[PDB]
Coordinates of all heavy atoms in Angstrom, one line a residue:
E1 N -25.8 -55.2 15.4 CA -27.0 -54.6 16.1 C -26.6 -53.8 17.3 O -25.5 -53.9 17.9 CB -27.9 -55.8 16.6 CG -27.2 -56.7 17.6 CD -28.1 -58.0 17.8 OE1 -29.3 -57.9 17.9 OE2 -27.5 -59.1 17.9
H2 N -27.5 -52.9 17.7 CA -27.4 -52.3 19.0 C -27.9 -53.2 20.0 O -28.8 -54.0 19.7 CB -28.1 -50.9 19.1 CG -28.0 -50.2 20.4 ND1 -26.9 -49.4 20.6 CD2 -28.8 -50.1 21.5 CE1 -27.0 -48.9 21.8 NE2 -28.2 -49.3 22.4
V3 N -27.4 -53.2 21.3 CA -28.0 -54.0 22.4 C -28.5 -53.0 23.4 O -27.7 -52.5 24.2 CB -27.0 -55.0 23.0 CG1 -27.6 -55.8 24.1 CG2 -26.5 -56.0 21.9
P4 N -29.8 -52.7 23.4 CA -30.4 -51.8 24.3 C -30.2 -52.2 25.8 O -30.1 -51.4 26.7 CB -31.9 -51.8 24.0 CG -32.0 -53.1 23.1 CD -30.8 -53.1 22.4
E5 N -30.1 -53.5 26.0 CA -29.9 -54.1 27.3 C -28.6 -53.7 28.0 O -28.6 -53.2 29.1 CB -30.0 -55.6 27.2 CG -30.0 -56.4 28.5 CD -29.4 -57.7 28.5 OE1 -29.7 -58.5 27.5 OE2 -28.5 -58.0 29.4
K6 N -27.5 -53.9 27.3 CA -26.2 -53.7 27.9 C -25.5 -52.4 27.5 O -24.2 -52.3 27.5 CB -25.3 -55.0 27.7 CG -25.9 -56.3 28.0 CD -25.0 -57.4 27.9 CE -25.7 -58.7 27.7 NZ -24.9 -59.9 28.2
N7 N -26.3 -51.5 27.0 CA -25.8 -50.2 26.6 C -24.5 -50.3 25.7 O -23.6 -49.5 25.9 CB -25.6 -49.2 27.8 CG -26.8 -49.0 28.6 OD1 -27.9 -49.5 28.3 ND2 -26.7 -48.2 29.6
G8 N -24.6 -51.2 24.8 CA -23.4 -51.5 24.0 C -23.8 -52.0 22.6 O -25.0 -51.9 22.2
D9 N -22.8 -52.5 21.8 CA -23.1 -52.9 20.4 C -22.3 -54.2 20.1 O -21.3 -54.5 20.7 CB -22.8 -51.8 19.4 CG -23.4 -50.5 19.8 OD1 -22.7 -49.8 20.7 OD2 -24.5 -50.1 19.4
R10 N -22.9 -55.0 19.2 CA -22.2 -56.1 18.7 C -21.7 -55.9 17.2 O -22.4 -55.4 16.4 CB -23.1 -57.3 18.7 CG -22.6 -58.5 17.9 CD -23.6 -59.6 17.8 NE -22.8 -60.8 17.4 CZ -22.4 -61.8 18.2 NH1 -22.9 -61.8 19.5 NH2 -21.7 -62.7 17.7
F11 N -20.4 -56.2 17.0 CA -19.8 -56.0 15.7 C -19.3 -57.3 15.2 O -19.0 -58.2 15.9 CB -18.5 -55.1 15.8 CG -18.9 -53.6 16.0 CD1 -19.0 -53.2 17.3 CD2 -19.0 -52.7 15.0 CE1 -19.3 -51.8 17.6 CE2 -19.2 -51.4 15.2 CZ -19.4 -50.9 16.5
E12 N -19.3 -57.5 13.8 CA -18.5 -58.6 13.2 C -17.3 -58.0 12.6 O -17.4 -57.1 11.7 CB -19.4 -59.3 12.2 CG -18.7 -60.5 11.5 CD -18.4 -61.7 12.4 OE1 -19.1 -61.9 13.4 OE2 -17.5 -62.4 12.1
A13 N -16.1 -58.5 12.9 CA -14.9 -57.9 12.5 C -14.0 -58.8 11.7 O -13.9 -60.0 11.9 CB -14.1 -57.5 13.8
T14 N -13.4 -58.2 10.7 CA -12.4 -58.8 9.8 C -11.2 -57.9 9.7 O -11.4 -56.7 9.2 CB -13.1 -58.9 8.4 OG1 -14.3 -59.6 8.5 CG2 -12.1 -59.7 7.4
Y15 N -10.1 -58.2 10.3 CA -9.0 -57.3 10.3 C -7.7 -58.0 10.5 O -7.6 -59.2 10.8 CB -9.1 -56.2 11.3 CG -9.3 -56.5 12.8 CD1 -8.4 -56.0 13.7 CD2 -10.4 -57.2 13.2 CE1 -8.6 -56.3 15.1 CE2 -10.6 -57.5 14.6 CZ -9.7 -57.0 15.5 OH -10.0 -57.3 16.8
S16 N -6.6 -57.3 10.3 CA -5.2 -57.8 10.5 C -4.4 -57.0 11.5 O -4.7 -55.8 11.7 CB -4.5 -57.9 9.1 OG -5.2 -58.8 8.2
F17 N -3.5 -57.6 12.1 CA -2.5 -57.0 13.0 C -1.1 -57.1 12.4 O -0.6 -58.2 12.1 CB -2.4 -57.9 14.3 CG -3.7 -58.0 15.0 CD1 -4.8 -58.8 14.6 CD2 -3.8 -57.4 16.3 CE1 -6.0 -58.9 15.3 CE2 -5.0 -57.5 17.0 CZ -6.1 -58.2 16.5
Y18 N -0.5 -55.9 12.1 CA 0.7 -55.8 11.4 C 1.9 -55.5 12.3 O 1.9 -54.6 13.2 CB 0.6 -54.7 10.3 CG -0.3 -55.1 9.2 CD1 -1.7 -54.8 9.3 CD2 0.1 -55.8 8.1 CE1 -2.6 -55.2 8.3 CE2 -0.7 -56.3 7.2 CZ -2.0 -56.0 7.2 OH -2.8 -56.4 6.2
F19 N 3.0 -56.3 12.1 CA 4.1 -56.3 13.0 C 5.4 -55.9 12.2 O 6.5 -56.5 12.4 CB 4.3 -57.7 13.6 CG 3.2 -58.1 14.6 CD1 2.0 -58.6 14.1 CD2 3.5 -58.2 15.9 CE1 1.0 -59.0 15.1 CE2 2.6 -58.6 16.9 CZ 1.3 -59.0 16.4
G20 N 5.3 -55.0 11.3 CA 6.4 -54.5 10.5 C 7.1 -55.6 9.6 O 6.3 -56.3 8.9
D21 N 8.4 -55.7 9.7 CA 9.1 -56.8 9.0 C 8.7 -58.2 9.3 O 8.9 -59.1 8.5 CB 10.6 -56.6 9.1 CG 11.2 -55.6 8.2 OD1 10.5 -55.2 7.2 OD2 12.4 -55.3 8.3
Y22 N 8.1 -58.4 10.5 CA 7.7 -59.8 10.9 C 6.6 -60.4 10.2 O 6.5 -61.6 10.1 CB 7.4 -59.8 12.4 CG 8.6 -59.7 13.4 CD1 8.7 -58.6 14.3 CD2 9.7 -60.6 13.3 CE1 9.8 -58.5 15.1 CE2 10.8 -60.5 14.2 CZ 10.8 -59.4 15.1 OH 11.9 -59.3 15.9
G23 N 5.7 -59.5 9.6 CA 4.5 -60.0 8.9 C 3.2 -59.6 9.6 O 3.2 -58.5 10.2
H24 N 2.2 -60.4 9.5 CA 0.9 -60.1 10.1 C 0.1 -61.3 10.4 O 0.4 -62.5 10.0 CB 0.2 -59.1 9.1 CG -0.6 -59.9 8.0 ND1 0.0 -60.1 6.8 CD2 -1.9 -60.4 8.0 CE1 -0.9 -60.8 6.0 NE2 -2.0 -60.9 6.7
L25 N -0.9 -61.1 11.2 CA -1.9 -62.1 11.6 C -3.3 -61.5 11.2 O -3.6 -60.3 11.3 CB -2.0 -62.2 13.1 CG -0.8 -63.0 13.7 CD1 -0.7 -62.7 15.2 CD2 -1.0 -64.5 13.4
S26 N -4.1 -62.5 10.8 CA -5.5 -62.1 10.3 C -6.5 -62.7 11.2 O -6.3 -63.9 11.7 CB -5.7 -62.4 8.8 OG -4.9 -61.5 8.0
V27 N -7.6 -62.1 11.4 CA -8.7 -62.6 12.2 C -10.1 -62.4 11.7 O -10.3 -61.5 10.9 CB -8.6 -62.1 13.7 CG1 -7.3 -62.3 14.4 CG2 -9.1 -60.6 13.8
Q28 N -11.1 -63.1 12.2 CA -12.5 -63.0 11.9 C -13.3 -63.3 13.1 O -13.0 -64.4 13.8 CB -12.9 -63.9 10.7 CG -14.2 -63.6 9.9 CD -14.4 -64.4 8.7 OE1 -13.5 -65.1 8.1 NE2 -15.7 -64.5 8.2
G29 N -14.2 -62.5 13.5 CA -15.0 -62.8 14.7 C -15.8 -61.7 15.3 O -15.9 -60.6 14.7
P30 N -16.3 -61.9 16.6 CA -17.1 -60.9 17.3 C -16.2 -59.9 18.1 O -15.3 -60.2 18.8 CB -17.8 -61.8 18.3 CG -16.9 -62.9 18.6 CD -16.1 -63.2 17.3
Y31 N -16.6 -58.6 17.9 CA -16.2 -57.5 18.7 C -17.4 -56.9 19.4 O -18.3 -56.4 18.7 CB -15.5 -56.4 17.9 CG -15.3 -55.1 18.7 CD1 -14.7 -55.0 19.9 CD2 -15.8 -53.9 18.2 CE1 -14.5 -53.8 20.6 CE2 -15.7 -52.7 18.9 CZ -15.0 -52.7 20.1 OH -14.9 -51.5 20.8
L32 N -17.5 -57.0 20.7 CA -18.6 -56.6 21.5 C -18.1 -55.6 22.5 O -17.2 -55.8 23.2 CB -19.2 -57.8 22.3 CG -19.2 -59.2 21.5 CD1 -19.2 -60.4 22.5 CD2 -20.4 -59.3 20.6
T33 N -18.8 -54.4 22.5 CA -18.3 -53.3 23.3 C -18.5 -53.5 24.8 O -18.0 -52.7 25.6 CB -19.0 -51.9 22.8 OG1 -20.4 -52.0 23.1 CG2 -18.8 -51.7 21.4
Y34 N -19.2 -54.6 25.2 CA -19.6 -54.8 26.5 C -19.1 -56.0 27.2 O -19.4 -56.3 28.4 CB -21.2 -54.8 26.6 CG -21.8 -55.8 25.6 CD1 -22.0 -57.1 26.0 CD2 -22.2 -55.4 24.3 CE1 -22.6 -58.0 25.1 CE2 -22.7 -56.3 23.4 CZ -22.9 -57.6 23.8 OH -23.5 -58.5 22.9
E35 N -18.3 -56.8 26.5 CA -17.6 -58.0 27.1 C -16.4 -58.5 26.3 O -16.2 -58.0 25.2 CB -18.6 -59.2 27.3 CG -19.3 -59.7 26.1 CD -20.2 -60.8 26.3 OE1 -21.0 -60.8 27.3 OE2 -20.2 -61.8 25.6
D36 N -15.6 -59.3 26.9 CA -14.5 -59.9 26.2 C -15.0 -61.0 25.2 O -16.1 -61.6 25.4 CB -13.6 -60.7 27.2 CG -12.9 -59.7 28.2 OD1 -13.0 -58.5 28.0 OD2 -12.3 -60.3 29.1
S37 N -14.2 -61.2 24.2 CA -14.6 -62.1 23.1 C -13.4 -62.8 22.6 O -12.3 -62.3 22.7 CB -15.4 -61.4 22.0 OG -14.6 -60.4 21.4
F38 N -13.6 -63.9 21.9 CA -12.6 -64.7 21.2 C -12.8 -64.6 19.8 O -14.0 -64.8 19.3 CB -12.6 -66.1 21.7 CG -11.9 -66.4 23.0 CD1 -12.5 -66.2 24.2 CD2 -10.6 -66.9 23.0 CE1 -11.8 -66.4 25.4 CE2 -9.9 -67.1 24.1 CZ -10.5 -66.9 25.4
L39 N -11.8 -64.2 19.0 CA -11.9 -64.3 17.5 C -11.1 -65.4 16.9 O -10.2 -66.0 17.6 CB -11.5 -62.9 16.9 CG -12.3 -61.7 17.3 CD1 -11.8 -61.1 18.6 CD2 -12.2 -60.6 16.2
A40 N -11.5 -65.8 15.7 CA -10.8 -66.9 15.0 C -9.5 -66.3 14.4 O -9.6 -65.2 13.8 CB -11.6 -67.5 14.0
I41 N -8.4 -67.0 14.5 CA -7.2 -66.6 13.7 C -7.3 -67.3 12.3 O -7.2 -68.5 12.2 CB -5.9 -67.1 14.4 CG1 -5.8 -66.5 15.8 CG2 -4.7 -66.7 13.5 CD1 -4.5 -67.0 16.6
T42 N -7.5 -66.5 11.3 CA -7.8 -67.0 9.9 C -6.5 -67.4 9.2 O -6.5 -68.1 8.2 CB -8.6 -66.0 9.1 OG1 -7.8 -64.8 9.1 CG2 -9.9 -65.8 9.7
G43 N -5.3 -66.8 9.6 CA -4.1 -67.0 8.9 C -3.0 -66.0 9.2 O -3.3 -65.1 10.1

């Protein structure tokens, strides 16, 4: 959704962080353009 209140938006995110030969981490959670958030580490 858009948040008219805080001139921002709320996202639901599913993505990975890639570290070359080391491998990767995967996450699922909130990305909010207007504050810090914690996402779950899925594996």
Side-chain angles (χ1 to χ4, degrees):
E1 61 192 322
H2 185 83
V3 181
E5 189 210 312
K6 313 189 199 205
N7 301 359
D9 316 79
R10 166 187 199 104
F11 289 86
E12 179 67 27
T14 304
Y15 58 123
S16 298
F17 299 71
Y18 291 92
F19 292 77
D21 276 350
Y22 288 122
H24 83 268
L25 286 163
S26 291
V27 306
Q28 196 172 346
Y31 165 57
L32 321 157
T33 67
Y34 54 87
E35 59 181 42
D36 295 350
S37 62
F38 276 82
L39 301 84
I41 302 174
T42 56

